[PDB]
Amino acid sequence: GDRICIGYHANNSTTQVDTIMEKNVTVTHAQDILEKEHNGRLCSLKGVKPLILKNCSVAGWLLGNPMCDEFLNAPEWSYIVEKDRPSNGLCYPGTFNYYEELKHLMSSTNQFEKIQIFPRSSWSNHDASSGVSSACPYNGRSSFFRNVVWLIKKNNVYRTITRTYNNTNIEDLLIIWGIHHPNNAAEQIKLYQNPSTYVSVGTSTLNQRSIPEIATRPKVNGQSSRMEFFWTILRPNDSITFESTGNFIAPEYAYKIVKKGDSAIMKSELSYSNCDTKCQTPVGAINSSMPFHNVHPFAIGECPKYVKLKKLVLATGLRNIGAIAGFIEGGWQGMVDGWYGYHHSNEQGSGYAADKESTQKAVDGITNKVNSIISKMNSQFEAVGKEFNNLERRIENLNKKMEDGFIDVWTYNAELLVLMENERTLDLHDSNVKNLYDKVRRQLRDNAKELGNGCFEFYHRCDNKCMESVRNGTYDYPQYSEESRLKREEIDSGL
Amino acid sequence: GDRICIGYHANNSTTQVDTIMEKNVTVTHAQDILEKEHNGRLCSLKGVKPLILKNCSVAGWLLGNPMCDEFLNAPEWSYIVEKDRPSNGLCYPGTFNYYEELKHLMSSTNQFEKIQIFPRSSWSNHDASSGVSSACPYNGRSSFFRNVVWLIKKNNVYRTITRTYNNTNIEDLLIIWGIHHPNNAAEQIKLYQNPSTYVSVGTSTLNQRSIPEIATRPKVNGQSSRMEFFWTILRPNDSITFESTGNFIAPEYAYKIVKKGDSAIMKSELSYSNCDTKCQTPVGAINSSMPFHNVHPFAIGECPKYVKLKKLVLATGLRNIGAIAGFIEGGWQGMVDGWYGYHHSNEQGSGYAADKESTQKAVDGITNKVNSIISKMNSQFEAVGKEFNNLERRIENLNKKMEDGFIDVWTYNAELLVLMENERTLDLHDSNVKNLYDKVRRQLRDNAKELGNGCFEFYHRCDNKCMESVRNGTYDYPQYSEESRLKREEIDSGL
Amino acid sequence: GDRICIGYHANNSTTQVDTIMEKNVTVTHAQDILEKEHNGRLCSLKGVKPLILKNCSVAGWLLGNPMCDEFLNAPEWSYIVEKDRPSNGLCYPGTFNYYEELKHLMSSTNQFEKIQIFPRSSWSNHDASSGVSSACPYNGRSSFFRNVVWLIKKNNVYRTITRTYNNTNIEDLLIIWGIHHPNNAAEQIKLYQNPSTYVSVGTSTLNQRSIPEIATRPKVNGQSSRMEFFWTILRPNDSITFESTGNFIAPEYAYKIVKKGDSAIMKSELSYSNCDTKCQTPVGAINSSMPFHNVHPFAIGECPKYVKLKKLVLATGLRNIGAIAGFIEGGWQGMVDGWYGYHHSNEQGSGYAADKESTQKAVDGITNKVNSIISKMNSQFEAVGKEFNNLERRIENLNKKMEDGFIDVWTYNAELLVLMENERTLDLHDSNVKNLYDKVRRQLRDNAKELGNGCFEFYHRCDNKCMESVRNGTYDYPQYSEESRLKREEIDSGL
Ligand SMILES: *[C@@H]1O[C@H](CO)[C@@H](O)[C@H](O)[C@H]1NC(C)=O
Ligand SMILES: *[C@@H]1O[C@H](CO)[C@@H](O)[C@H](O)[C@H]1NC(C)=O
Ligand SMILES: *[C@@H]1O[C@H](CO)[C@@H](O)[C@H](O)[C@H]1NC(C)=O
């Protein structure tokens, strides 16, 4: 005979959530925060295309391997794409000193302008056209690196070369040259006649006199000789001088470094698509709305933080209890707008009014706890691409263990935070429904019988508007004091 | 006159446990998870012995220093043991280029097969037997590295050598050679006659022409001359060519790399024992049943995770309160099977029945919380052995700071987890005993007086089987409604 | 008519504190733990001054660039200060091999003693005074590095040099020498006459024969020639031998390494002040009383742990609620010594007595939780100074990413701990005031009416000393049993 109940929300949700102590708990509202799909393509970064080297490697492109395409337009890029094992590199076999350190410098570089420092037609005293090879073909012919000039003896003499370029520009200059290492002393004379030659080069900060290491080697790409290349950055206002009496592989073209910034060299086997992203990975681009992904560790752009987990979901509301009577027995499918509320049961009432003011105290402190934990990972470890030669293995592994180390550390930090605050989310829900109960029972005191299912029966009487009397905190015990006590002492001596 | 009490377990345990806020709290059940003893021996890893180099270093073994023993059987190993300062290395003094990079490659290597590429008896045009030294003795005689051939002028001439080996095998080949650096120009001619010689060597990817650096040096192991060694890996189907006019230290034997995998070079001063482990450390092996140890950071095998702590113990049950009456006053030594229960006190009852269904709801969620926190460290940072030469100090310290850095990070992660979930374990125990109380008081309502020690006295009466009426959740208030109220209004007007 | 209330402290505090779920909560007592001011000066470390190189670089000092000052006193230092771009280095242009590895060795070094190994006046067979240059001026004259001797042909001959130094000392010796690289073959003969010369040097472990790389270069500091320097550490009982026929830049002075320990090279643009600290950073010293700072990551000394946060404050007491009646309504400005207490309201009482025994159970477990969380970061990652040449960029970035990585990791660990234990601090306060309430209501049972504001009215009566009866846990219900029940059944049938 006349009731009021404390209860909480329940709905059709089946999304599940974990804590430290429980797995797979059905909750009423949750929020996935792990991105796990990608679009499988290479795309532009916010309107800036990558440089897709195709089957060419970085050396192939910079040296001008005849099978590689130059970028005459001087386009800026957002990153650079190189296949894992590019097929078009040093078509003429050899080595490329500090190649990896250079590939690294590329990673902070967004735009080149190729310029001419020594035109091919200016080597008056030597042969600048016979320097081609079956190893570097072009349309079936013998050709050569398009940016360096293989210099050959003219009419049986190699006059000593001394040429200098003064960097009048304001940008750094990337300059590449090399030296030729023949098979045998016959070939040395056949090509440069001087039996004993050097390639010397000087700047403010660079000092190197290179000599030819004649030796007998197996044939790569048809050649048993070798060409070894060098590089350096000529600073603004500085100058560079090459002196050679032979074997010199001369620069024609240098690269003006005209834009630096966030960039990268991505190893990927994919080609281009009409496509834009904010976050790009080697196997595809990412819809960067979630704060965490597990697609690939080497993502670049404005990206979610990478974590090694199959799932990462935060709890937002109650557990999903149908559930009857008061809150002791579970949730109310019949309460729709609010997480915690009550239920009119008078001689005319229907029920199910929510306590707006502790549900928007709730949806306030959880919506604020959600961003506060995301931002807690703003400074999470983003991994960076880097390469290493076959005698840099210790530092490669070092680099690999430090990037795995942090990925594991932040994977754990994120799993634990979600698990911990998920437990703190559900326990919070258990606290407000119990504290809702307590405000009404510290209101209705003697005047009301508390049933232990989560509901109260009144010894006095209360219409619809005395039910708002107790829902508001506005209830007045003396406004029914005398009535109520007169009506339970009648049960004390009742039936 | 007639009672029932809520209470919890208490026993003879004295194992202690810590939380964030308290130290040294006596608990009823706990679980150590830190392994801190080792067996003090070098053992096999799961049936696969290590390679114990004894007083020999890795170069000593690979070069065949006469005092080192070859491994003619070609045994596979689980790891390699090298004393800290091995005594048998380059018995003939010198250097060993990229030694550390090679020791590193050994760490991913489990089996060699030594093979012959250039037999000593095939150097028809030079002396292959006079090349021995008092620096490399064998049975008191002068001997030499057993795997390289010191080549000497024959009958006063050193014909130019050009020999090539074609790697017809399917495995990688480790090949070692060297060059001799004499004291003075007299000795250069005394041994090789050509005053100006080189050691050239080529592969697909290797190009090096080495020249002798004659200089005056102090005598190591009786010699003031030096031998400098080189190494390289000859790929399957590739070939290698040495050309020398003198000073060449020639390979006889190469190492077929026939098994790669998890391996390591352990620095340890211990010798072998008839002994097997699953986890091996430089100072001894570990009984790998616990998920954490503190024995040594450089453990290899299926190992617990290393942490810098003297202790790591998780709480499993209650605090250990003797403790009297209801739960307000502490635990019941008298309750044996269950963590939470009650106590029959009727006109014939004895007491102490456990609530099976919230104790195996308890021993369920703690046993599940224990493995869930162990596995939370599956991806914990395992450290790796690595070495560095005396001009690689910056990267040595880098490597040392990154491995300490992660050990400190995961030591903290583990101490905090245990401390935090230990507090969440004990607070949980406090929640079920209080919630056990609440189910019975929301059952027995008016019909019962609640004492505040944790017990209830009944205004009606209840036999043994009405005590199971309230222990089951099966109690019926109207089944004693009228009786009980009639019997406290008799106390309202009682004595 | 006659009352007692449960309540808690409230005061004039406005210091604010955050948790996982709330920001900016006003608390009654807190504790800042983040140091964020510095004194802006370079100071001594605990009585040991730094070595302030001023405008000179480390090479400038060690080589004796005429513009640098030697440290004749051989002072020990606590660290070394070098401006970012020092102006006084290789006044004679060139390179300094493994410079960074040497700067690193300095970081574990606290005291040099310069000693003489080859006095300038002992080069009887060559010119030891003409070796000066307009590039290395001193008082406007031409001078030279004060610690090496530029050796010149004597009277048109350069006799081959063979000199050796035997390290009879017990300390390690730092030894520096170099070689001269002329512009052209004329200058080579003009200075050393031998057209083909070397600089050879040997120790137990060092073997290097250096040759001059003549090339045409741009002029630095007026010179287009180059001097290239080398260094090595001569061990106790070992000896070193230089052999040259020219271009040798000879050591005069070596550095006895006489004290090693904690040291560093600090990059700072500041000069010295009459000043001592326990913790020094490049932009100033720190009052090292707090356990965390955010002043600069490269602090040295007994220092707080560096974290990237604008604020780090722990909660110590209650939230700051004026707040009326019992605890339901907030704090009591009127309670001064204790965090939790009560309030005499009898027919003569005043009120406000604190429960000493659960407030010093409180100020005990929070003061113990404060140090326990500080010490939890004893093993926090301290960063270390290190440098890298322009072809060591990959390992520079590696080093930078690993030191940022740990700073981010420990910044997060510390923000989360403070936020988490701040929530555990306030919830604890909410637990004791509610449990204080429960001890008194489990004491005064029937004999007392519980109002729901946090207070109780007595059906019996209780003077001042029956209020200590209930504050002590010493209350006796039968000592007012009969009285109280007789006096609420009078209200049951009352007005
Ligand atoms: C799930 O419940 C919501 C109300 O909470 C309702 O609007 C929606 O249509 C329901 N969906 C299904 C499939 O039942
Ligand atoms: C400790 O208590 C257990 C029962 O919980 C009992 O079986 C065991 O014998 C006791 N041991 C000692 C030494 O008292
Ligand atoms: C703040 O309160 C303390 C007592 O808690 C008092 O001693 C102090 O004088 C007060 N300060 C101000 C500025 O009101």
mmCIF file with all atom_site columns, N, CA, C and O in Angstrom, chain B residues 93-114:
data_model
loop_
_atom_site.group_PDB
_atom_site.id
_atom_site.type_symbol
_atom_site.label_atom_id
_atom_site.label_alt_id
_atom_site.label_comp_id
_atom_site.label_asym_id
_atom_site.label_entity_id
_atom_site.label_seq_id
_atom_site.pdbx_PDB_ins_code
_atom_site.Cartn_x
_atom_site.Cartn_y
_atom_site.Cartn_z
_atom_site.occupancy
_atom_site.B_iso_or_equiv
_atom_site.pdbx_formal_charge
_atom_site.auth_seq_id
_atom_site.auth_comp_id
_atom_site.auth_asym_id
_atom_site.auth_atom_id
_atom_site.pdbx_PDB_model_num
ATOM 1  N N  . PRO B 1 93  ? 99.891 -10.846 -31.117 1.00 0.00 ? 93  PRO B N  1
ATOM 2  C CA . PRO B 1 93  ? 99.138 -9.639  -30.792 1.00 0.00 ? 93  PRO B CA 1
ATOM 3  C C  . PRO B 1 93  ? 98.636 -8.946  -32.039 1.00 0.00 ? 93  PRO B C  1
ATOM 4  O O  . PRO B 1 93  ? 99.230 -9.022  -33.112 1.00 0.00 ? 93  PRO B O  1
ATOM 5  N N  . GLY B 1 94  ? 97.506 -8.273  -31.883 1.00 0.00 ? 94  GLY B N  1
ATOM 6  C CA . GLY B 1 94  ? 96.979 -7.489  -32.983 1.00 0.00 ? 94  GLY B CA 1
ATOM 7  C C  . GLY B 1 94  ? 95.569 -7.064  -32.680 1.00 0.00 ? 94  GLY B C  1
ATOM 8  O O  . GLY B 1 94  ? 95.168 -6.966  -31.519 1.00 0.00 ? 94  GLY B O  1
ATOM 9  N N  . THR B 1 95  ? 94.820 -6.820  -33.739 1.00 0.00 ? 95  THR B N  1
ATOM 10 C CA . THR B 1 95  ? 93.455 -6.373  -33.626 1.00 0.00 ? 95  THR B CA 1
ATOM 11 C C  . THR B 1 95  ? 92.579 -7.319  -34.432 1.00 0.00 ? 95  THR B C  1
ATOM 12 O O  . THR B 1 95  ? 93.068 -8.119  -35.236 1.00 0.00 ? 95  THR B O  1
ATOM 13 N N  . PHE B 1 96  ? 91.274 -7.236  -34.181 1.00 0.00 ? 96  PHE B N  1
ATOM 14 C CA . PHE B 1 96  ? 90.283 -8.078  -34.849 1.00 0.00 ? 96  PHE B CA 1
ATOM 15 C C  . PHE B 1 96  ? 89.115 -7.180  -35.242 1.00 0.00 ? 96  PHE B C  1
ATOM 16 O O  . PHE B 1 96  ? 88.281 -6.841  -34.406 1.00 0.00 ? 96  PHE B O  1
ATOM 17 N N  . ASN B 1 97  ? 89.063 -6.788  -36.508 1.00 0.00 ? 97  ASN B N  1
ATOM 18 C CA . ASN B 1 97  ? 88.140 -5.741  -36.917 1.00 0.00 ? 97  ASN B CA 1
ATOM 19 C C  . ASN B 1 97  ? 86.686 -6.187  -36.772 1.00 0.00 ? 97  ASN B C  1
ATOM 20 O O  . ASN B 1 97  ? 86.334 -7.351  -37.021 1.00 0.00 ? 97  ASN B O  1
ATOM 21 N N  . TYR B 1 98  ? 85.845 -5.232  -36.364 1.00 0.00 ? 98  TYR B N  1
ATOM 22 C CA . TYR B 1 98  ? 84.431 -5.468  -36.083 1.00 0.00 ? 98  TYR B CA 1
ATOM 23 C C  . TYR B 1 98  ? 84.259 -6.726  -35.260 1.00 0.00 ? 98  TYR B C  1
ATOM 24 O O  . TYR B 1 98  ? 83.388 -7.551  -35.532 1.00 0.00 ? 98  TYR B O  1
ATOM 25 N N  . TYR B 1 99  ? 85.120 -6.881  -34.248 1.00 0.00 ? 99  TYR B N  1
ATOM 26 C CA . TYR B 1 99  ? 85.010 -8.048  -33.373 1.00 0.00 ? 99  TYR B CA 1
ATOM 27 C C  . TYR B 1 99  ? 83.639 -8.081  -32.702 1.00 0.00 ? 99  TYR B C  1
ATOM 28 O O  . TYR B 1 99  ? 82.958 -9.110  -32.702 1.00 0.00 ? 99  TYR B O  1
ATOM 29 N N  . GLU B 1 100 ? 83.195 -6.932  -32.184 1.00 0.00 ? 100 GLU B N  1
ATOM 30 C CA . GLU B 1 100 ? 81.963 -6.889  -31.419 1.00 0.00 ? 100 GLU B CA 1
ATOM 31 C C  . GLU B 1 100 ? 80.766 -7.186  -32.301 1.00 0.00 ? 100 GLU B C  1
ATOM 32 O O  . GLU B 1 100 ? 79.840 -7.883  -31.869 1.00 0.00 ? 100 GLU B O  1
ATOM 33 N N  . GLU B 1 101 ? 80.774 -6.686  -33.541 1.00 0.00 ? 101 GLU B N  1
ATOM 34 C CA . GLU B 1 101 ? 79.694 -6.999  -34.477 1.00 0.00 ? 101 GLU B CA 1
ATOM 35 C C  . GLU B 1 101 ? 79.634 -8.489  -34.749 1.00 0.00 ? 101 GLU B C  1
ATOM 36 O O  . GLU B 1 101 ? 78.563 -9.018  -35.072 1.00 0.00 ? 101 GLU B O  1
ATOM 37 N N  . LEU B 1 102 ? 80.775 -9.175  -34.634 1.00 0.00 ? 102 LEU B N  1
ATOM 38 C CA . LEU B 1 102 ? 80.818 -10.607 -34.899 1.00 0.00 ? 102 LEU B CA 1
ATOM 39 C C  . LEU B 1 102 ? 80.305 -11.396 -33.703 1.00 0.00 ? 102 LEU B C  1
ATOM 40 O O  . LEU B 1 102 ? 79.427 -12.259 -33.848 1.00 0.00 ? 102 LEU B O  1
ATOM 41 N N  . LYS B 1 103 ? 80.860 -11.125 -32.518 1.00 0.00 ? 103 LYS B N  1
ATOM 42 C CA . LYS B 1 103 ? 80.299 -11.620 -31.270 1.00 0.00 ? 103 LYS B CA 1
ATOM 43 C C  . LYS B 1 103 ? 78.781 -11.426 -31.248 1.00 0.00 ? 103 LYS B C  1
ATOM 44 O O  . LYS B 1 103 ? 78.046 -12.274 -30.735 1.00 0.00 ? 103 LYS B O  1
ATOM 45 N N  . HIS B 1 104 ? 78.293 -10.320 -31.810 1.00 0.00 ? 104 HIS B N  1
ATOM 46 C CA . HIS B 1 104 ? 76.849 -10.133 -31.878 1.00 0.00 ? 104 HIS B CA 1
ATOM 47 C C  . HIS B 1 104 ? 76.190 -11.166 -32.787 1.00 0.00 ? 104 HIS B C  1
ATOM 48 O O  . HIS B 1 104 ? 75.179 -11.768 -32.416 1.00 0.00 ? 104 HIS B O  1
ATOM 49 N N  . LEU B 1 105 ? 76.733 -11.363 -33.994 1.00 0.00 ? 105 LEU B N  1
ATOM 50 C CA . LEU B 1 105 ? 76.200 -12.369 -34.917 1.00 0.00 ? 105 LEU B CA 1
ATOM 51 C C  . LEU B 1 105 ? 76.205 -13.751 -34.289 1.00 0.00 ? 105 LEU B C  1
ATOM 52 O O  . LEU B 1 105 ? 75.279 -14.542 -34.515 1.00 0.00 ? 105 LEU B O  1
ATOM 53 N N  . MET B 1 106 ? 77.240 -14.061 -33.499 1.00 0.00 ? 106 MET B N  1
ATOM 54 C CA . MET B 1 106 ? 77.233 -15.311 -32.750 1.00 0.00 ? 106 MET B CA 1
ATOM 55 C C  . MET B 1 106 ? 75.974 -15.453 -31.901 1.00 0.00 ? 106 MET B C  1
ATOM 56 O O  . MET B 1 106 ? 75.442 -16.562 -31.767 1.00 0.00 ? 106 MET B O  1
ATOM 57 N N  . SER B 1 107 ? 75.475 -14.347 -31.336 1.00 0.00 ? 107 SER B N  1
ATOM 58 C CA . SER B 1 107 ? 74.326 -14.398 -30.435 1.00 0.00 ? 107 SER B CA 1
ATOM 59 C C  . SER B 1 107 ? 73.052 -14.888 -31.111 1.00 0.00 ? 107 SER B C  1
ATOM 60 O O  . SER B 1 107 ? 72.130 -15.316 -30.420 1.00 0.00 ? 107 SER B O  1
ATOM 61 N N  . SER B 1 108 ? 72.965 -14.843 -32.436 1.00 0.00 ? 108 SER B N  1
ATOM 62 C CA . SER B 1 108 ? 71.824 -15.423 -33.129 1.00 0.00 ? 108 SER B CA 1
ATOM 63 C C  . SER B 1 108 ? 72.200 -16.724 -33.823 1.00 0.00 ? 108 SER B C  1
ATOM 64 O O  . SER B 1 108 ? 71.535 -17.117 -34.787 1.00 0.00 ? 108 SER B O  1
ATOM 65 N N  . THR B 1 109 ? 73.258 -17.396 -33.357 1.00 0.00 ? 109 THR B N  1
ATOM 66 C CA . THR B 1 109 ? 73.830 -18.555 -34.044 1.00 0.00 ? 109 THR B CA 1
ATOM 67 C C  . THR B 1 109 ? 73.869 -19.721 -33.071 1.00 0.00 ? 109 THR B C  1
ATOM 68 O O  . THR B 1 109 ? 74.301 -19.549 -31.930 1.00 0.00 ? 109 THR B O  1
ATOM 69 N N  . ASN B 1 110 ? 73.440 -20.903 -33.515 1.00 0.00 ? 110 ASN B N  1
ATOM 70 C CA . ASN B 1 110 ? 73.456 -22.086 -32.654 1.00 0.00 ? 110 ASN B CA 1
ATOM 71 C C  . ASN B 1 110 ? 74.317 -23.245 -33.151 1.00 0.00 ? 110 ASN B C  1
ATOM 72 O O  . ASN B 1 110 ? 74.485 -24.210 -32.394 1.00 0.00 ? 110 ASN B O  1
ATOM 73 N N  . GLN B 1 111 ? 74.848 -23.215 -34.386 1.00 0.00 ? 111 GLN B N  1
ATOM 74 C CA . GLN B 1 111 ? 75.678 -24.335 -34.842 1.00 0.00 ? 111 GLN B CA 1
ATOM 75 C C  . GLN B 1 111 ? 76.603 -23.956 -36.007 1.00 0.00 ? 111 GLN B C  1
ATOM 76 O O  . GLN B 1 111 ? 76.151 -23.422 -37.035 1.00 0.00 ? 111 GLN B O  1
ATOM 77 N N  . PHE B 1 112 ? 77.888 -24.286 -35.856 1.00 0.00 ? 112 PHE B N  1
ATOM 78 C CA . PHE B 1 112 ? 78.894 -24.151 -36.908 1.00 0.00 ? 112 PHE B CA 1
ATOM 79 C C  . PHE B 1 112 ? 79.254 -25.520 -37.460 1.00 0.00 ? 112 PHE B C  1
ATOM 80 O O  . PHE B 1 112 ? 79.224 -26.526 -36.742 1.00 0.00 ? 112 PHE B O  1
ATOM 81 N N  . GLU B 1 113 ? 79.603 -25.552 -38.740 1.00 0.00 ? 113 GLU B N  1
ATOM 82 C CA . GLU B 1 113 ? 80.353 -26.669 -39.314 1.00 0.00 ? 113 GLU B CA 1
ATOM 83 C C  . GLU B 1 113 ? 81.596 -26.080 -39.979 1.00 0.00 ? 113 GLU B C  1
ATOM 84 O O  . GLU B 1 113 ? 81.489 -25.320 -40.949 1.00 0.00 ? 113 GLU B O  1
ATOM 85 N N  . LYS B 1 114 ? 82.761 -26.371 -39.416 1.00 0.00 ? 114 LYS B N  1
ATOM 86 C CA . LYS B 1 114 ? 84.007 -25.914 -40.004 1.00 0.00 ? 114 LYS B CA 1
ATOM 87 C C  . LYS B 1 114 ? 84.262 -26.699 -41.280 1.00 0.00 ? 114 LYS B C  1
ATOM 88 O O  . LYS B 1 114 ? 84.079 -27.920 -41.314 1.00 0.00 ? 114 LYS B O  1
#
